[PDB]
Design an enzyme around this catalytic site. Sequence first.
Site, PDB file in Angstrom:
ATOM      1  N   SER A   1     -11.892  10.237  -4.411  1.00  0.00           N
ATOM      2  CA  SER A   1     -11.471  10.027  -3.059  1.00  0.00           C
ATOM      3  C   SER A   1      -9.937   9.913  -3.103  1.00  0.00           C
ATOM      4  CB  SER A   1     -12.117   8.798  -2.475  1.00  0.00           C
ATOM      5  OG  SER A   1     -11.647   7.620  -3.132  1.00  0.00           O
TER       6      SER A   1
ATOM      7  N   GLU B   1       0.786  -1.211   0.000  1.00  0.00           N
ATOM      8  CA  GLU B   1       0.000   0.000   0.000  1.00  0.00           C
ATOM      9  C   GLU B   1       0.844   1.298   0.000  1.00  0.00           C
ATOM     10  OE1 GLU B   1      -3.033   0.128  -0.710  1.00  0.00           O
ATOM     11  OE2 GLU B   1      -3.947  -1.814  -0.144  1.00  0.00           O
TER      12      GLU B   1
ATOM     13  N   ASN C   1      -7.824   8.404  -5.941  1.00  0.00           N
ATOM     14  CA  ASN C   1      -8.556   7.324  -6.623  1.00  0.00           C
ATOM     15  C   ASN C   1      -9.345   7.928  -7.791  1.00  0.00           C
ATOM     16  OD1 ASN C   1      -7.764   5.360  -4.584  1.00  0.00           O
ATOM     17  ND2 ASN C   1      -9.303   6.209  -3.243  1.00  0.00           N
TER      18      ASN C   1
ATOM     19  N   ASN D   1      -9.140   5.184   2.879  1.00  0.00           N
ATOM     20  CA  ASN D   1      -9.845   5.953   1.880  1.00  0.00           C
ATOM     21  C   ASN D   1     -10.746   7.050   2.522  1.00  0.00           C
ATOM     22  OD1 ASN D   1     -10.741   5.075  -1.346  1.00  0.00           O
ATOM     23  ND2 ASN D   1     -12.247   6.117  -0.174  1.00  0.00           N
TER      24      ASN D   1
ATOM     25  N   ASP E   1     -12.425   7.718  -8.339  1.00  0.00           N
ATOM     26  CA  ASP E   1     -13.692   8.253  -7.942  1.00  0.00           C
ATOM     27  C   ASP E   1     -13.592   9.637  -7.286  1.00  0.00           C
ATOM     28  OD1 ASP E   1     -12.800   7.683  -5.412  1.00  0.00           O
ATOM     29  OD2 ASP E   1     -14.496   6.389  -4.844  1.00  0.00           O
TER      30      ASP E   1
ATOM     31  N   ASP F   1      -6.596   8.035  -0.775  1.00  0.00           N
ATOM     32  CA  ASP F   1      -6.096   7.094   0.208  1.00  0.00           C
ATOM     33  C   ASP F   1      -4.899   7.730   0.925  1.00  0.00           C
ATOM     34  OD1 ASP F   1      -7.915   5.183  -0.909  1.00  0.00           O
ATOM     35  OD2 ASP F   1      -6.279   4.026  -1.765  1.00  0.00           O
TER      36      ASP F   1
END
Length: 129
Positions: free
Chosen positions: A50, A35, A46, A59, A48, A52
């Site tokens: 959002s 990660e 991301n 998220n 969308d 992280d």
Amino acid sequence: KVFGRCELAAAMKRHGLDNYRGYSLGNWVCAAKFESNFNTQATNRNTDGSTDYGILQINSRWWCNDGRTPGSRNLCNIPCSALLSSDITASVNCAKKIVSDGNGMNAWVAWRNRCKGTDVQAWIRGCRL
Ligand SMILES: [Cl-]
Ligand SMILES: [Cl-]
Ligand SMILES: [Cl-]
Ligand SMILES: [Cl-]
Ligand code: NA
Ligand SMILES: [Ru+3]
């Protein structure tokens, strides 16, 4: 902070992640590797909209507030910036809630694609734990 492998394993253990929801420490270390490469300051946007955040790439759509993710929740009740701290407490507390949400560690796509079913114990090999 960029942690060492055994340094992060030690911190995750101290914070109660070793076998949390039945997930051995190696699973948590492996997830953090893929990660964030062990970097608490890691951020990734991301598709969308959002973002992280941190060691475990939590998220902004469900888990933390960053003020820019429409229609989102903050189920960990924290600013996403707390997840970028050298102190991993906030990330661990929030990961505890995520992994308890029903799908276990599959919530972390990189855990599912790169750690799940592998020899995750290799990740804690040689650490004084
Ligand atoms: Cl392990
Ligand atoms: Cl906030
Ligand atoms: Cl810590
Ligand atoms: Cl499970
Ligand atoms: Na949010
Ligand atoms: Ru600590």
